[PDB]
Subunit: 233 residues, 2 copies
């Protein structure tokens, strides 16, 4: 067929968003070098004894860094103290989270305007949340504290007498509110009395109680007593 | 049935890793007993400047050997004011340069084995060109932002430029085009024969098209290879 035409064609011929990004980054690196080196000095210099100070500092630091077009891209041009900066942000986050959780468990109210099943389910789901969070915490806090201690970051909140312990105590508060809802609903109906839900309910209560007793590490007076109030039904 | 027994069971109970903990102690051990060693490495990294990239290679070689004394590098260094940005810059500069040099040496010091039949030799050269094209296109794709960082960290960037190793690679790509057009112009005479003529239009096109592809990649042809191209055009 037509290989000559093809070769003549070839011979007679032998005679995107990223560039903008690169320039924006370059702009920052040139015109904000001193600003960034300043931030780096402050981070390196920082030391905290109050976790609330640390919070304020990370707040500040995030705000300052938000003036950078892309934090990672720009910072990769600098002798930025990544390890400590990460330690600080991570500490800030964990603390605030744990605190959220504790305020959520402590201030939990068994809404009497809720029927039995949704109420018990509410508490069960909360307990699950608490259990996951704390278990993750225990799973990571030792290596975390190893790093934090090097970086002048407080760790008392991380201990057993810290926010975690407070959380376990309110877990027992929860088992109380649950056994209370169970012993209540156990009276609020009928009639014939046991009945198939009057044995099932008693079990959900007993078992929730045991699950929490094991989680928290033990029971106080009033709840060991409520559990006793369950044994005798 | 028997729910009381169950509740009594629970009552009578309400009376009475090591792979990760080991790792943690090992790390704690390094952090305690290698703090000065690490702060020293960090000082040395921060202080460094290179003018020859070969010097840089030597440095990163050393740095890797030194860091290998750590039970887990990431775990230990996360305890220190380590210059992560620059250390990363250095290691990647070393890796890219050595990779590029491996490639350039492979394409330049490539031999068209005359002891191999047509198709396998042509496949060899085609696949090497593919390798080359992928590497260079990726390099061009990332080199600008790389150079931006490198310049900040006192890391050489000439090898990254168009007159750097990339140019060498493009030139040896044209040499590969000569060798392909050689294998074709040869095989177009050899087999079998007589009689003959199968693929004598196909093989020729494979030659022409390979030449054009390379010509476009490398940026042009010199005298002698453009001459091999006329030696192919006239068939």
């Amino acid at each position: 067929h037509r290989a000559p035409e093809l070769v003549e064609f070839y011979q007679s011929l032998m005679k995107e968003n990223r560039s903008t990004f690169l320039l924006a980054v370059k702009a920052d690196v040139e015109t904000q070098g001193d600003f960034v080196q300043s931030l780096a000095t402050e981070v390196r210099a920082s030391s905290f004894t109050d976790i609330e100070d640390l919070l304020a500092f990370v707040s500040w630091l995030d705000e300052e860094l938000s003036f950078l077009v892309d934090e990672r891209a720009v910072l990769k041009h600098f002798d930025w103290p990544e390890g400590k900066a990460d330690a600080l942000r991570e500490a800030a986050f964990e603390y605030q989270d744990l605190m959220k959780l504790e305020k959520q468990v402590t201030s939990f109210v068994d809404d009497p305007n809720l029927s039995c099943e949704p109420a018990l389910k509410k508490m069960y789901k909360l307990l699950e949340k608490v259990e996951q969070s704390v278990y993750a915490l225990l799973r990571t806090r030792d290596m975390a504290i190893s790093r934090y201690k090097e970086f002048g970051i407080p760790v008392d909140w991380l201990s057993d007498t810290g926010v975690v312990g407070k959380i376990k105590l309110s877990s027992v508060q929860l088992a109380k509110k649950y056994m209370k809802r169970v012993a209540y609903e156990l009276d609020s109906v009928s009639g014939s009395d046991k009945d198939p839900n009057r044995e099932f309910l008693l079990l959900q209560g007993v078992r929730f109680a045991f699950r929490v007793h094991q989680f928290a590490g033990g029971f106080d007076a009033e709840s060991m007593k409520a559990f006793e109030e369950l044994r005798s039904r």
